């Protein structure tokens, strides 16, 4: 119900799923959408196309706040990194800056290698 005009998009692109959260500059979420909740399960969920649909729904979820400019903070190695940023532009936002915020330990022991 409030008007912000200046939000931040957080793409969370993992190998299994993509989550798009659009927050204001203060970090309070306005809306979100995921590839899994966009009608995609399993093999579909982890595609660049499933992330594009997830981005559009998140842009459709925050339409009542009238966001005009949008910072994009991309995290993770997922296939939905690049295609989610395009869909935010296709919706009609202005991408002011794009940053990679993927957390890198400089840390803990990772899990053991899978013997598939």
């Amino acid at each position: 119900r409030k008007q912000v005009s200046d939000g931040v998009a957080h793409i969370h692109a993992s190998f299994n799923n993509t989550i798009v959260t659009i927050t204001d500059r203060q970090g309070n979420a306005l809306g979100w959408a995921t590839a899994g909740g966009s009608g995609f399960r399993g093999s579909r969920k982890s595609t660049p196309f499933a992330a594009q649909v997830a981005a559009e729904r998140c842009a459709d979820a925050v339409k009542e706040y009238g966001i005009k400019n949008l910072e994009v903070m991309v995290k993770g190695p997922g296939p939905g990194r690049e295609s989610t940023i395009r869909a935010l532009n296709a919706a009609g936002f202005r991408i002011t800056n794009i940053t990679d915020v993927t957390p890198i330990p400089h840390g803990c022991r990772p899990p053991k290698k899978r013997r598939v």
Binding site: F40, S43, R44, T47, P48, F49, A50
Partner: protein, 153 residues
């Protein structure tokens, strides 16, 4: 094949209208090499179709196809043991062939008495998006849409 030494085959136009698209439809509908039987079925079907829609012989047959031609289809590909249906665009020649094949097979599985009427009834519904020829186009387009995420190799 593995060599790709396949050139296109010559095909004579239809006698009554000189339509190349119509000659291919007779061949698709022909059974056992009896082309004269297939031409007489196609002609009398078109006379019923043209009179029933009032438009014409040829381009009223073109209106039947334009509602049956598919524009996207899925080809199988198995990646992790599970087979992905990968949607791929259909080139113009195959769009015509599929539509004519879908019309003939839908017409054949119909309860009319004669095939010439049976074909005309199928084409008439296809012109108005009611037949079982257009329903198979419906299915292909939604099988291709359920797989749009796989538009890659």
């Amino acid at each position: 094949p593995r060599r790709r030494v396949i050139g296109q085959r010559k095909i004579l136009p239809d006698p009554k209208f000189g339509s190349e698209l119509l000659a291919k439809f007779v061949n698709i509908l022909m059974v056992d090499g009896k082309k004269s039987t297939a031409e007489s079925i196609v002609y009398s079907a078109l006379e019923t179709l043209a009179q029933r829609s009032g438009k014409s012989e040829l381009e009223a047959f073109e209106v039947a196809l334009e509602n049956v031609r598919p524009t996207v289809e899925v080809k199988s590909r198995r990646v992790g043991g599970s087979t992905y249906q990968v949607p791929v665009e259909v080139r113009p020649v195959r769009r015509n062939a599929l539509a004519m094949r879908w019309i003939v097979e839908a017409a054949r599985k119909r309860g009319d008495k004669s095939m010439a009427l049976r074909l005309a009834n199928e084409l008439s519904d296809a012109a108005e998006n009611k037949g079982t020829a257009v329903k198979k186009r419906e299915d292909v387009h939604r099988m291709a849409e359920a797989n749009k995420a796989f538009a890659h190799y």
